[PDB]
Structures are given as C-alpha cells and as structure tokens.
Tab-separated table of C-alpha atoms in Angstrom:
chain	number	residue	atom	x	y	z
X	1	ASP	CA	116.912	68.203	24.160
X	2	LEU	CA	116.435	65.534	26.825
X	3	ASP	CA	119.541	66.877	28.546
X	4	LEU	CA	118.624	70.546	28.348
X	5	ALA	CA	115.134	69.710	29.566
X	6	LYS	CA	116.741	67.941	32.527
X	7	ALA	CA	118.668	71.156	33.238
X	8	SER	CA	115.982	73.779	32.627
X	9	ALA	CA	113.483	71.854	34.737
X	10	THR	CA	115.555	71.957	37.925
X	11	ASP	CA	116.174	75.579	37.015
X	12	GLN	CA	112.575	76.218	37.999
X	13	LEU	CA	112.929	74.565	41.428
X	14	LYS	CA	116.122	76.490	42.108
X	15	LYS	CA	114.126	79.674	41.342
X	16	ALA	CA	111.114	78.472	43.316
X	17	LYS	CA	112.928	77.952	46.610
X	18	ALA	CA	114.342	81.467	46.406
X	19	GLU	CA	110.946	82.967	45.644
X	20	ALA	CA	109.456	80.976	48.513
X	21	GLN	CA	111.931	82.240	51.095
X	22	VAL	CA	111.598	85.784	49.765
X	23	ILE	CA	107.867	85.900	50.377
X	24	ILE	CA	108.253	84.203	53.755
X	25	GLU	CA	110.790	86.844	54.725
X	26	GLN	CA	108.429	89.586	53.612
X	27	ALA	CA	105.648	87.966	55.651
X	28	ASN	CA	107.870	88.151	58.714
X	29	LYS	CA	108.789	91.780	58.002
X	30	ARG	CA	105.121	92.752	57.773
X	31	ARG	CA	104.582	90.787	60.982
X	32	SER	CA	107.154	92.764	62.906
X	33	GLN	CA	105.786	96.030	61.502
X	34	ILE	CA	102.243	95.110	62.572
X	35	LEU	CA	103.404	94.195	66.053
X	36	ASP	CA	105.611	97.223	66.612
X	37	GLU	CA	102.948	99.628	65.363
X	38	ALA	CA	100.159	98.111	67.436
X	39	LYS	CA	102.424	98.193	70.486
X	40	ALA	CA	103.467	101.814	69.939
X	41	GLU	CA	99.872	102.926	69.473
X	42	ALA	CA	98.422	100.974	72.407
X	43	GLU	CA	101.021	102.641	74.604
X	44	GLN	CA	99.311	105.936	73.870
X	45	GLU	CA	96.025	104.509	75.150
X	46	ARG	CA	97.758	103.364	78.316
X	47	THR	CA	99.413	106.710	78.955
X	48	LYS	CA	96.267	108.702	78.294
X	49	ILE	CA	94.030	106.585	80.500
X	50	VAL	CA	96.614	106.818	83.282
X	51	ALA	CA	97.149	110.565	83.027
X	52	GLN	CA	93.384	111.001	82.967
C	1	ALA	CA	97.331	100.378	82.870
C	2	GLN	CA	94.364	99.515	85.056
C	3	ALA	CA	96.513	97.987	87.791
C	4	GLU	CA	98.743	101.072	87.635
C	5	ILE	CA	95.694	103.149	88.542
C	6	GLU	CA	94.546	100.889	91.349
C	7	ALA	CA	98.016	101.194	92.897
C	8	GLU	CA	97.834	104.988	92.799
C	9	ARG	CA	94.448	104.966	94.477
C	10	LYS	CA	95.708	102.761	97.291
C	11	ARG	CA	98.806	104.876	97.730
C	12	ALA	CA	97.078	108.271	97.855
C	13	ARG	CA	94.551	106.824	100.280
C	14	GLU	CA	97.340	105.636	102.566
C	15	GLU	CA	99.069	108.995	102.514
C	16	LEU	CA	95.830	110.773	103.370
C	17	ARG	CA	95.300	108.405	106.294
C	18	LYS	CA	98.853	108.959	107.554
C	19	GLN	CA	98.413	112.708	107.826
C	20	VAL	CA	95.183	112.503	109.797
C	21	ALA	CA	96.631	109.860	112.137
C	22	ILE	CA	99.636	111.921	113.150
C	23	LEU	CA	97.447	114.993	113.555
C	24	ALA	CA	95.157	112.962	115.818
C	25	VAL	CA	98.010	112.096	118.121
C	26	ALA	CA	99.536	115.584	118.067
C	27	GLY	CA	96.176	117.120	118.852
C	28	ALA	CA	95.470	114.708	121.671
C	29	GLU	CA	98.855	115.621	123.109
C	30	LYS	CA	98.198	119.349	123.025
C	31	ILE	CA	94.722	118.853	124.510
C	32	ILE	CA	96.125	116.658	127.265
C	33	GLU	CA	98.871	119.122	128.149
C	34	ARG	CA	96.188	121.851	128.287
C	35	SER	CA	93.491	120.005	130.216
C	36	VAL	CA	95.257	118.158	133.033
C	37	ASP	CA	94.817	119.342	136.604
C	38	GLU	CA	95.746	117.883	139.932
C	39	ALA	CA	92.547	115.971	140.536
C	40	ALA	CA	92.962	114.188	137.197
C	41	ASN	CA	96.594	113.302	137.849
C	42	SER	CA	95.607	111.849	141.203
C	43	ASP	CA	92.723	110.048	139.508
C	44	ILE	CA	95.200	108.341	137.164
C	45	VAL	CA	97.789	107.393	139.773
C	46	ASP	CA	95.244	106.195	142.323
C	47	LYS	CA	93.852	103.854	139.727
C	48	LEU	CA	97.155	102.468	138.500
C	49	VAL	CA	98.239	101.638	142.029
C	50	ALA	CA	95.126	99.462	142.357
C	51	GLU	CA	96.024	97.176	139.440
C	52	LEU	CA	99.725	97.392	140.304
C-alpha cells in the first residue's frame, strides 16, 4: 500500500498538468474569439462613419 | 477612420481649388484677347522698353 500510494499520488499530478494546459488553451481560444469579434464589429463602425 | 475623413476633406478641397484656378487663367486669356487695342499694346511695349 505504500507502493501503490506512491504511484496513485503522482497519478494526480500527471492528470493535473494536462487539466492545467487544457484550460490555458481554452483561455487562449476565447481570447482569439474575443479579439476577432471585436475587430470585425469595430470595422463596421469605421465603414459606416466613413460612408456617412 | 477619422484620419481617413480628414484626408478626403483635404483632397476634395484641392480639386475644387484646381478647377477655379484653371478657369481663372482661361477666362483672363479670353478677356485679354477680346479687350486689347492698339493703344494698350503700345502702352505695354513703351513701358517695357523703359526698364529694358
């Protein structure tokens, strides 16, 4: 039980690094979506003020 | 977008000035060709010979 505790502990850190990078990646995806959407929608403001 | 409007103002203004300038010279030319008579020609030449 000492040995299998040794193993199943580091199991959790192996899991934890994956679930860290997954949420970081999702943060970056939401970042790029925020930026691209704000850019695409501000371009409408530019074009309308100019055409006006 | 604001700079892109300032540029268009400047450019339309310039075009509108260009037209009037070339009409000013064309008109002055037609008037001149219509108004000259021998006393005026002599008035011009007799002056230029004095500063000659």
